[PDB]
Ligand binder design. Structure first.
Ligand SMILES: C[C@@H]1O[C@@H](O[C@@H]2[C@@H](O[C@H]3O[C@H](CO)[C@H](O)[C@H](O)[C@H]3O)[C@@H](O)[C@@H](CO)O[C@H]2O)[C@@H](O)[C@H](O)[C@@H]1O
Ligand SMILES: C[C@@H]1O[C@@H](O[C@@H]2[C@@H](O[C@H]3O[C@H](CO)[C@H](O)[C@H](O)[C@H]3O)[C@@H](O)[C@@H](CO)O[C@H]2O)[C@@H](O)[C@H](O)[C@@H]1O
Lengths: 301, 301
């Protein structure tokens, strides 16, 4: 079964780490950064990893019930989380946290909504601090703050729709949350990725995400767009080597702009030595060329 | 090229008319309703129709700039809309409105966000009344209300992230907006669908969407889940007849629960005479069985 990528332009790709479209391709030196995202992780044979699941809208969402208001706390609530489809999260599941759980540290801004058993409804702005000691999705519980303390009901079906960042301070896209809280190690993680081959860098699919306030340009970089993950999952084609050579191609001119290594574990490297935003034609897309080895030498971008 | 559906359970499907997961299958008598959704429209050969586009998160979103505050209006703003990827919308485009434009009448609740050219950012709750005379996406302009009038900047990159309904009153999922405003007819519409064959009803993929306030259970029914549309688009397989026989199958037991007609124009009918929520196994999914004619007699559910 021949290996394929979906035919999708940059304007037809979704970020796999936050529910927004891809804005651009991006590459930079790895430096001292540990790149270990848990969303947007999929081996080329279609095996999902970390906290990766198939629903793009569900990335960074939460579901469950508000069991109680935080003691001595105004505008802060305790949530018992379930899976995206509302089923109980089993903490013994061999995963870092419920699938779709955010994989970055920061204050996530969005809207908390409820429909009570009697169909009484409410929506209110909310923030979820993923860097907080009270953020323990792996234990089935997180904390949610609102601006107004009065209008949130207890033990009623609750959802969180992510919108963007509350603030930029403390936001680090590569710093994983402590899914189980303080002094506890994360488990079942998709491994970190790094460009091993000399002269190579990771190529990212970048989105500039919304911000509630302040001056900044917060970005989320994913290793594979969500659609590629969805495609890989369906195809389940056996990887023939540890690297698929892919070529970014303009379908109109036939011009192959550049080539890249799509690694078996689900990330892309390119021969590039600086941090730039690639600028590709709107009609262009990666096409699978052939299987090669990890030591194949790419044409420098 | 053999026709296929993606292998996806109900818990792996996204609504094509609002950016949320599918909750359930649903069927009811058509009655006097005109079912003519513009999102979630795709022929079986992969031809997108109405306002349908590929990005699930982008459904019911808006992008553009706030050109001015509505005269003599507090908390109401004018938006000049662009396409999802930020490109200019061309009103001469042979479509009812910019792709992704909501296709139902009501008050849409969400979050308006901006990043100024200087990277100054803000997010604020917002409502977009699609039943309003000022809702004219086909003309490249809509109106957006906020709660606070002060903190929205003019001529700065703006996005709207949909969350749910502001209110239930006036919400009709089958009543299209007047995309060009008062006294103007919609154009380039995907045609209405209806069960022609005696004893048949449309089968829908239903989601219960969030609500800002009041007591209600607002639902959005789509004809095809977004993933099926994405799959059809990629496959572009030629339809061999006007109807694909599909069978909802439990992959574990092998039990075929029921069968349905998947029509060439992209909707499903079933032999069913009442309005019920189907209840299918979590592991189940439709599988293509064969091409048949429009007059094939389905086993009653
Ligand atoms: C850069 C600046 O960011 C925002 O104003 C902040 C403000 O942040 C919050 O409060 C305001 C309302 O006062 C808005 O709701 C923001 O969206 C919130 O994030 C505060 O932190 C104050 C503290 O003095 O600093 C301001 O700069 C935003 O509203 C402004 O438009 C502007 O972009
Ligand atoms: C059924 C009821 O709906 C909501 O309260 C409404 C309220 O609606 C808005 O204002 C409140 C705050 O006062 C909340 O923000 C709602 O989310 C808003 O939609 C008003 O319409 C009042 C008018 O008297 O009626 C209330 O019923 C909701 O807050 C309640 O929890 C409840 O579900």
């Amino acid at each position: 079964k021949p290996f394929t990528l979906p035919i999708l332009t940059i304007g037809e790709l979704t970020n796999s780490r936050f529910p927004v479209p891809i804005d651009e391709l991006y590459t930079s030196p790895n430096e001292s950064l540990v790149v270990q995202p848990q969303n947007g992780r999929c081996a080329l044979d279609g095996e999902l990893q970390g906290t990766t699941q198939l629903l793009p809208t569900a990335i960074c969402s939460f579901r469950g019930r508000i069991n109680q208001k935080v003691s001595g706390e105004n505008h802060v609530w305790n949530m018992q989380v379930t899976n995206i489809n509302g089923t109980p999260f089993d903490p013994t599941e061999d995963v870092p946290a419920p699938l779709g759980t955010p994989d970055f540290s920061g204050k996530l801004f969005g809207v908390l909504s409820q429909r009570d058993h009697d169909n009484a409804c409410r929506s209110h702005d909310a923030v979820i601090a993923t860097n907080s000691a009270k953020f323990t999705p792996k234990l089935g519980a997180i904390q949610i703050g609102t601006w107004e303390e009065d209008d949130v009901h207890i033990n009623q079906p609750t959802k969180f729709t992510p919108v963007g960042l509350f603030e930029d301070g403390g936001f680090n896209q590569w710093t994983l949350p402590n899914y189980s809280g303080a002094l506890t190690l994360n488990m079942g993680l998709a491994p970190p990725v790094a460009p091993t081959f000399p002269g190579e860098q990771i190529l990212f699919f970048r989105s500039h995400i919304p911000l509630k306030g302040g001056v900044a340009d917060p970005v989320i970089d994913c290793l594979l767009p969500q659609e590629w993950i969805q495609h890989l999952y369906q195809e389940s084609a056996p990887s023939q080597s540890d690297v698929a050579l892919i070529r970014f191609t303009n379908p109109d001119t036939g011009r192959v702009l550049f080539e890249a290594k799509l690694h078996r574990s689900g990330y892309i490297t390119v021969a590039n030595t600086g941090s730039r935003p690639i600028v590709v034609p709107a009609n262009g897309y990666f096409r699978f060329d052939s299987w090669v080895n990890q030591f194949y030498s790419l044409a420098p971008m």
